[PDB]
């Protein structure tokens, strides 16, 4: 969880990307993750819409178009590992901002109209550089949030681990 100084540094980003005017029968949540790695590295993972299995906890595989070149509106077909209440997810790339390090997708099962946004943020103090990733989502209610929270948190933990390994 973020320190007071980090939360102060992220307030604008939160206000711009992770704050929703919720419609009835939908809830949202915001999660954060500190990563001991440079933002460029974290972003290069986070941005790869075609290969979410590189850091998502439950993805078995991800099929995408042949001759895939990544653009907003493009789709992916995620096959998930066995033991979960769905087997498959078709997902659409909503945002890809390489300048500002912002991405997001929408699902198109229980988590109906799930849409998330992910942002990458640089921090430096005393020559020590690290990253914070924020991820928020909107989802239709059936506490469905507990289940999405767990996936999101787990995905973000593995993001850290993979990024921290690549940074070594």
Ligand X SMILES: CC1=C[C@@H](OCC#Cc2ccc(C)cc2)CC(C)(C)[C@@]1(O)/C=C/C(C)=C\C(=O)O
* Closest to a copy of itself by CB, 45 or 80: 80
116 binds, among a copy of itself, ligand X, none (CB under 5 to 8 A by kind): ligand X
The correct pick among 16, 63, 110, 129 for binding ligand X (CB under 6 A) is 110
Residue 128 CB, nearest distance to ligand X (Å)?
29
Length of the chain: 168
Report how far residue 69's alpha carbon sits from residue 97's, in angstroms, rounded to the nearest whole number: 15
CA angle, residues 152, 57, 157, in degrees to nearest 5: 60
The correct pick among 53, 96, 153, 167 for binding a copy of itself (CB under 8 A) is 153
Residue 135 CB, nearest distance to ligand X (Å)?
7
116 in a labelled binding site: yes
Residues 116-155 that bind ligand X (CB under 6 A): 116, 143-144, 146-148, 150-152, 155
Sole window of 47-55, 78-86, 111-119, 121-129 interacting with a copy of itself (rule: CB under 8 A): 78-86
**Nearest alpha-carbon partner for 105 in 70, 62, 72:** 72
Report how far residue 162's alpha carbon sits from residue 40's, in angstroms, rounded to the nearest whole number: 14
What secondary structure letter does DSSP report for 14?
Answer: H
CB of 85 closer than 8 Å to CB of 109:
yes
120 exposure class (CB count in 10 Å sphere: 0-12, 13-18, 19+) = buried
Residue 19 CB, nearest distance to ligand X (Å)?
19
The correct pick among 16, 60, 84, 108 for binding a copy of itself (CB under 8 A) is 84
């Amino acid at each position: 969880e973020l320190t007071p100084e980090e939360r102060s540094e992220l307030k604008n980003s939160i206000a711009e990307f992770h704050t929703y005017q919720l419609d009835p029968g939908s809830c949202s949540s915001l999660h954060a993750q500190r990563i001991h790695a440079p933002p460029e590295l974290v972003w290069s993972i986070v941005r790869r819409f075609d290969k979410p299995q590189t850091y998502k906890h439950f993805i078995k595989s991800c099929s995408v178009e042949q001759n895939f070149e990544m653009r907003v509106g493009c789709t992916r077909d995620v096959i998930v590992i066995s033991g979960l209440p769905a087997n498959t997810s078709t997902e659409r790339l909503d945002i890809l901002d390489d300048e500002r390090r912002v991405t997001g997708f929408s699902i198109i099962h229980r988590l109906t109209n799930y849409k998330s946004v992910t942002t990458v943020h640089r921090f430096e103090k005393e020559n020590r550089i690290w990253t914070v990733v924020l991820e928020s989502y909107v989802v239709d209610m059936p506490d469905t949030r507990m289940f999405a929270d767990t996936v999101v948190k787990l995905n973000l933990q593995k993001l850290a681990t993979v990024a921290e390994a690549m940074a070594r």
